[PDB]
From a paper:
In addition to the anti-TNF activity attributed to the N-terminal four cysteine-rich domains (CRDs) homologous to host TNF receptors, CrmB and CrmD have anti-chemokine activity attributed to a unique C-terminal extension (∼160 aa), named as the SECRET domain (smallpox virus-encoded chemokine receptor). Biochemical analysis revealed that the SECRET domain binds a subset of human and mouse CC, CXC and C chemokines, including CCL28, CCL25, CCL20, CXCL12, CXCL13, CXCL14, and XCL1. The identification of other poxvirus genes encoding homologues with the SECRET domain indicates that the SECRET domain represents a new family of viral CKBPs, which has specific folding to allow its binding with chemokines, either independently or fused with vTNFRs. Here we report the crystal structures of the SECRET domain of CrmD encoded by an ECTV strain and the complex of it with chemokine CX3CL1.
To directly elucidate the chemokine binding by the SECRET domain, we reconstituted a complex of the SECRET domain with the chemokine domain of CX3CL1 and determined its structure at a resolution of 2.6 Å. In the complex, one SECRET domain monomer binds one CX3CL1 monomer, displaying a 1∶1 stoichiometry. The SECRET domain contacting residues are from the strands 1, 5, and 6 of β-sheet I and the C-terminal extended loop, while the CX3CL1 contacting residues are from the N-loop, 310 helix, 40s loop, and the β3 strand. The binding interface can be described as a small hydrophobic core surrounded by a large halo of hydrophilic interactions. The acidic residues D167, E169, and D316 from the SECRET domain form salt-bridge interactions with R44, R47, and K18 from CX3CL1, respectively. Mutating charged residues K18, R44, and R47 in CX3CL1 induced more significant binding affinity decrease than mutating hydrophobic residues I19, L23, and F49, suggesting the importance of the salt-bridge interactions in the complex formation of the SECRET domain with CX3CL1. It suggests that although the SECRET domain does not directly block the most important receptor binding site on CX3CL1 (i.e. the N-termini and critical hydrophobic residues of the N-loop), its binding is still close to the receptor binding site and bring steric hindrance to prevent efficient interaction with the receptor, which would provide a structural basis for the ability of the SECRET domain to inhibit CX3CL1 and CCL25 induced cell migration.
Author numbering:
A (entry chain A): 161 to 318
B (entry chain B): 8 to 73
């Protein structure tokens, strides 16, 4: 039941700003002038080492990633909080994922502030890269139709 | 040709990259193919330092795997 790697993938539509500012720290953020994404985690052993954000048209992908050099301590429970805030917002509801069973321990919360996205997918990927076959828990949220972002490269912020 | 190099990709975090390959002369632009953790391919331009370092990095990983 262990894992050693976490990925967060956020796809959004439609978005207008492309210049972006990012930070990995106790509070991890990806910011444009129209959007703010914030990641806090707690008791998570794998370490986040960067984030990304790339847009094609008004279609964007973005997210946060750890390396895979360390496994999750199984005596504590990794907790992932993700907030997606419109700079033009007020109402702050959280989100419900596709139901499903998981082989690894973790908790996650996705909060959304604002109404500026027609489309929003959010994937949290807990992965055990010490597996022979693909060994990933995938917690998925959708607010409408599932966007395709293959073909959009995960560029760093700029 | 599974891929033909139109636009080149701008900087991708070296941590997200898992493989690179020389692209066929026949395929498209004679450039480098990059593979990401998400199982995706993008065409990069070998002259940029970033791509160069990326390559020396994956090269470093492939050795070690041996």
């Amino acid at each position: 039941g262990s894992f050693n790697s976490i990925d967060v993938e956020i796809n959004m539509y439609p978005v207008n700003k492309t210049s972006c500012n990012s930070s990995i720290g106790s509070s991890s953020t990806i910011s444009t002038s129209e959007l703010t994404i914030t990641l806090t985690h707690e008791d998570c052993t794998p370490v986040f080492i960067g984030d990304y954000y790339s847009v094609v048209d008004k279609l964007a992908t973005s997210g946060f990633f750890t390396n895979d050099k360390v496994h999750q301590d199984l005596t504590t429970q990794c907790k992932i909080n993700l907030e997606i805030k419109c700079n033009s917002g007020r109402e702050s509801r959280q989100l419900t994922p596709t139901t499903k069973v998981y082989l690894m321990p973790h908790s996650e919360t996705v909060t959304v502030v604002g109404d500026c996205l027609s489309n929003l997918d959010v994937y949290i990927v807990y992965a055990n890269t010490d597996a022979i076959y693909s060994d990933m828990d995938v917690v998925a949220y959708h607010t409408s139709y599932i966007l395709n972002v293959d073909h959009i490269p995960p560029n760093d912020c700029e | 040709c599974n891929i033909t190099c139109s636009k080149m990709t701008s900087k991708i975090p070296v941590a997200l990259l898992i493989h690179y390959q020389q692209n066929q002369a026949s395929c498209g632009k004679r450039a480098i193919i990059l593979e990401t953790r998400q199982h995706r391919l993008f065409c990069a331009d070998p002259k940029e330092q970033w791509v160069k370092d990326a390559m020396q990095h994956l090269d470093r990983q492939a050795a070690a795997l041996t």
